[PDB]
Every structure is written in C-alpha cells, then in structure tokens.
Amino acid sequence: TKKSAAEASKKPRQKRTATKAYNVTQAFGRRGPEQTQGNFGDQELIRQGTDYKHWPQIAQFAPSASAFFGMSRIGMEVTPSGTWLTYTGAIKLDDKDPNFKDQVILLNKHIDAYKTFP
Amino acid sequence: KSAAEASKKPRQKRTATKAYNVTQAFGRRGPEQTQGNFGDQELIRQGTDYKHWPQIAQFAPSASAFFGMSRIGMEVTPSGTWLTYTGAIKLDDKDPNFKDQVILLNKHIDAYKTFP
Ligand code: NA
Ligand code: NA
Ligand code: NA
C-alpha cells in the first residue's frame, strides 16, 4: 500500500517522495517564480509525483547523492529564517541517446508550466 | 565496480568510491560556474567510502525532491543541451546535531583552495 500523506510528510523535505497519496504541492509546495519555490511540473505530474506515467524518464536526470555533492556548487547561507545549504549545477543530455528528442519534449512540457494554470 | 565499469553511468548517476574517486567521476574541484566545489582531500579520495558520508548524504535530495524543490531550466549551447538546477535545503536548527552538521558541511565547501 502507498504511504499516507501524514506518514510521508514526516520525512525531511529533501527526502520526501511525491505520489498520488502525497502530491508535489503537498510535499514540495506550490510551483511558482520565487527563488524558494520549485517551477517544475505540469498538472498531471504535480498530482501524481512518482506515479506519473513518464516519471522514470524524468528521474534519469536526478543526481545520486554522490553526484549531487560531486557535480554541484554547494554553499551555506544564514538568514533570519534559518541556515540553508544552497546548490546549483547543470546536467548534460546525451545527444547520442536514441530518445534525446523525446527527452527535450518531456522536459519542456514541465518547465514553468505552472504559468499556464487556471 | 571498477573505474571502467562505474564510469559507464551518466555523470549524474555516478557513485564515487575509493576505486572511482570524486575527481575521476566528477572532475577536479574548482571555482568555475559549473565545476563542483565540494570535498576536502579525504572525501575526494574516498567518495561514498568516506566514513562520515551518511551525515553528508542526509542532505542529498531524492529524485522526487530534486524535481520538486529545485528551479529547473534548459540551455542549448555549442556543447549540447543542459538541464540547469538551483535550490536550497533548510537545515533543522532544532536538531541537537545541528552545529556538527554545519561544521561537517563547512569542512568540505571550497576546501580545494587550500591544496593543489
Ligand atoms: Na500519469
Ligand atoms: Na523516442
Ligand atoms: Na560544467
């Protein structure tokens, strides 16, 4: 059985897994433009999280823990709200992957799509 | 899993170990805009074999959280097509281990500057 929102929400934010039972908004907040918000997901992905039909083709771009700390620029920022570990980086698509073109289409479908929402 | 084997993975799915270290998997640490800056000499040489690796990895995002928390972009350039990401993970300052967590993270951030 799928974990309830009550149970899944007990994980620290960065270790949460969105599903139909605990969706992207519930886990990670509303998509939005601010520096603190995520901007990724169309309505279907938002509602289904890792249950989304094309989730594996998105997750193939998410970094391992080793790669996350190995590839990114990591910083620390202390503010009246708290202490933050900051990260930035870039992941290259493999243009020799037979599914390259579909990967671009899939990613374009989800980037900043919240701007079109009712 | 040798260097030859582990290197077959896409960069973002690599696992650094003593046999395939952070430099070999992810490049030299450095200051440039998409070079990694994280790791003292011990971490660089051992990767996920570092004995305090669990206290670092507790801050690494799941795939769901990576795509849920971050600001994601795409850039096309002479080098290819890139997925860009930025974000921030809040430490829990009510955790009694908070101060040790800050110390452990600062031990590795930009530490490359102090060695060749
Ligand atoms: Na679906
Ligand atoms: Na295809
Ligand atoms: Na780079």
Side-chain angles (χ1 to χ4, degrees), chain A residues 14-16 18 31-32 34 37 39 59-60 62-64 66-67 70 72-74 81 83 85 87-91 93, chain B residues 12-14 16 29-30 32 35 37 57-58 60-62 64 68 70-72 81 83 85-91 106:
Chain A
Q14 70 277 9
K15 299 299 194 181
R16 289 174 180 176
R31 276 72 278 293
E34 305 303 342
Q37 302 172 291
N39 64 335
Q60 73 185 301
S64 65
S66 180
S72 314
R73 296 198 71 66
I74 302 293
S81 63
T83 301
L85 184 65
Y87 58 94
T88 67
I91 287 149
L93 280 62
Chain B
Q12 68 277 14
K13 296 303 196 195
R14 287 175 183 177
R29 275 71 278 298
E32 304 305 340
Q35 275 171 308
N37 62 339
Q58 75 184 296
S62 61
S64 177
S70 311
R71 300 198 66 77
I72 300 294
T81 305
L83 185 64
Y85 60 93
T86 70
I89 295 158
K90 191 180 152 157
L91 309 208
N106 279 327

Side-chain angles (χ1 to χ4, degrees), chain B residues 53-114:
Chain B
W53 178 252
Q55 291 66 46
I56 294 165
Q58 75 184 296
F59 298 107
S62 61
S64 177
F66 177 80
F67 278 101
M69 297 182 317
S70 311
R71 300 198 66 77
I72 300 294
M74 246 188 63
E75 276 173 14
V76 185
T77 79
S79 53
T81 305
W82 300 78
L83 185 64
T84 66
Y85 60 93
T86 70
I89 295 158
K90 191 180 152 157
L91 309 208
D92 184 358
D93 71 0
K94 291 290 161 273
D95 175 346
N97 304 305
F98 169 85
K99 285 186 177 171
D100 292 351
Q101 286 158 2
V102 168
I103 283 162
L104 175 52
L105 291 169
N106 279 327
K107 170 164 182 162
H108 294 286
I109 293 171
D110 283 336
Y112 71 91
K113 282 178 182 176
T114 69

Side-chain angles (χ1 to χ4, degrees), chain B residues 27-43:
Chain B
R28 281 173 151 197
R29 275 71 278 298
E32 304 305 340
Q33 194 39 98
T34 62
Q35 275 171 308
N37 62 339
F38 188 94
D40 74 10
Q41 277 178 112
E42 199 189 7
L43 175 51

Side-chain angles (χ1 to χ4, degrees), chain A residues 44 48 51-53:
Chain A
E44 196 179 342
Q48 296 172 351
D51 296 323
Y52 177 70
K53 63 197 165 161

